[PDB]
Amino acid sequence: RIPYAEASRALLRDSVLDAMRDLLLTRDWSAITLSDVARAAGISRQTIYNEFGSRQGLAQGYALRLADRLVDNVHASLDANVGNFYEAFLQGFRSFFAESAADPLVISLLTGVAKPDLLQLITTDSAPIITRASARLAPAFTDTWVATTDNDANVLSRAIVRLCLSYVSMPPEADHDVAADLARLITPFAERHGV
Amino acid sequence: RIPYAEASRALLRDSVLDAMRDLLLTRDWSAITLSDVARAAGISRQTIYNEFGSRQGLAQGYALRLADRLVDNVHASLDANVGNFYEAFLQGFRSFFAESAADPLVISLLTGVAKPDLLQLITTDSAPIITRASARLAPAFTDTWVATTDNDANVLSRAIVRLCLSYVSMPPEADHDVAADLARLITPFAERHGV
Numbered sequence: 001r002i003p004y005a006e007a008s009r010a011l012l013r014d015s016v017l018d019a020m021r022d023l024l025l026t027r028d029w030s031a032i033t034l035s036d037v038a039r040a041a042g043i044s045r046q047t048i049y050n051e052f053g054s055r056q057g058l059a060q061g062y063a064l065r066l067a068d069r070l071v072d073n074v075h076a077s078l079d080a081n082v083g084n085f086y087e088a089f090l091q092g093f094r095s096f097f098a099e100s101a102a103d104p105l106v107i108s109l110l111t112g113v114a115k116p117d118l119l120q121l122i123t124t125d126s127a128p129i130i131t132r133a134s135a136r137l138a139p140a141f142t143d144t145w146v147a148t149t150d151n152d153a154n155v156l157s158r159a160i161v162r163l164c165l166s167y168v169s170m171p172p173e174a175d176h177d178v179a180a181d182l183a184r185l186i187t188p189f190a191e192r193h194g195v
Numbered sequence: 196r197i198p199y200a201e202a203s204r205a206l207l208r209d210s211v212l213d214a215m216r217d218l219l220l221t222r223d224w225s226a227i228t229l230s231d232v233a234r235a236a237g238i239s240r241q242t243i244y245n246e247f248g249s250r251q252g253l254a255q256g257y258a259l260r261l262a263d264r265l266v267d268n269v270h271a272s273l274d275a276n277v278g279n280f281y282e283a284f285l286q287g288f289r290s291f292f293a294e295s296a297a298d299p300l301v302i303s304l305l306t307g308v309a310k311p312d313l314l315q316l317i318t319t320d321s322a323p324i325i326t327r328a329s330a331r332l333a334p335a336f337t338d339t340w341v342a343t344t345d346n347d348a349n350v351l352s353r354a355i356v357r358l359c360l361s362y363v364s365m366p367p368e369a370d371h372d373v374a375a376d377l378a379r380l381i382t383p384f385a386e387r388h389g390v
């Protein structure tokens with residue numbers, strides 16, 4: 001199916017940002033390096049710098065790949081409850097709050113101490129994680145059993161990205177159940193705008 | 196009936212922040228102290244830090260104000276549009292954008308170098324900003340001509356403030372017009388759930 005470098009890169013890559021998901025799991029993202037990371041994945045320094053390019057590049061690199069994995073859990077519950085827009089979107093959001101919170105970088109941004117660059121990533125240059133997780137999300141609405149026309153379905157997903165990105169930094173309050181409001185908020189969007 | 200010492204501090208606050216709103220016109224929020232403003236605001240050092248106390252006390256403060264200058268042209272343009280939700284919601288939002296962008300503390304967030312302080316406020320530590328401007332905006336839909344069942348005003352509002360904060364924290368990446376698209380998503384909610 002796919003050539004050597006093509007599948008040998010994506011091995012290296014998922015092999016680091018797996019190592020990172022591992023170092024980060026007992027220690028905190030300020031306490032971790034290219035070097036501490038390289039060591040843990042069993043590569044050189046000079047390789048992570050070529051593949052990612054920096055400690056920054058790894059970081060965002062961590063993020064993007066998380067974004068992907070997160071918008072993809074959606075097709076899960078979309079297939080789960082078919083023909084029912086509320087119960088689909090309920091479980092889709094129930095999940096996304098479950099998952100995003102349990103991630104080591106999330107947890108290490110939230111409870112860990114005052115990271116400038118984690119912060120700079122979720123703000124000043126989010127151009128990548130946002131642009132990307134949008135077009136990736138959009139097809140859950142456009143291609144699948146939830147009819148949505150195309151431009152209506154960018155507008156929707158493009159907003160659902162910017163929300164989740166907010167609820168990641170600033171997590172829903174256990175007083176009231178957020179997944180639900182949000183479901184009830186987009187369903188009225190869903191039905192008007194399908195084909 | 197404003198118990199004296201009370202309405203005097205309220206007068207006190209707007210005294211300082213109107214100093215900085217004026218200060219950040221010639222400078223950027225990096226070059227401002229307490230004792231940087233307490234001078235052109237016309238008060239003593241010790242006195243100001245007794246009300247706020249941090250640079251990021253008086254910054255967090257300027258923020259809940261701007262939350263409110265901005266959450267309050269809602270009821271205003273919500274009612275200038277009576278009967279048509281999309282025109283209402285739109286024009287309401289268009290102001291919130293061309294306003295937000297005009298404020299000097301935000302022009303500090305944006306073109307100003309690197310404030311890892313500010314980015315703490317609009318994201319992880321945004322918790323009070325959102326939480327206030329949330330119920331503050333709630334009534335606009337409850338007590339106005341969009342007669343919105345009480346819960347659905349927060350289900351609406353908890354959402355419209357998060358999504359707004361996030362053009363401040365994370366600047367629009369492409370040129371598609373965001374007030375437009377934002378109007379678009381909540382309209383079909385309101386049509387069904389208004390009363």
Ligand SMILES: CCCCCCCCCCCCCCCC(=O)O
Pocket residue numbers: 063066067070071074088089090091092093096105106121122129133137160161164165168
């Ligand atoms: C540094 C932190 C990284 C955060 C990355 C977050 C990416 C957000 C993606 C949005 C996922 C949308 C899931 C909701 C699915 C549904 O409609 O039910």
Ligand SMILES: CCCCCCCCCCCCCCCC(=O)O
Pocket residue numbers: 258261262265266269272273283284285286287288291300301304317324328332355356359360363
């Ligand atoms: C530097 C920090 C600033 C923080 C700004 C917080 C903004 C909160 C926004 C609430 C305004 C909602 C606008 C509604 C308009 C409408 O529906 O017609």
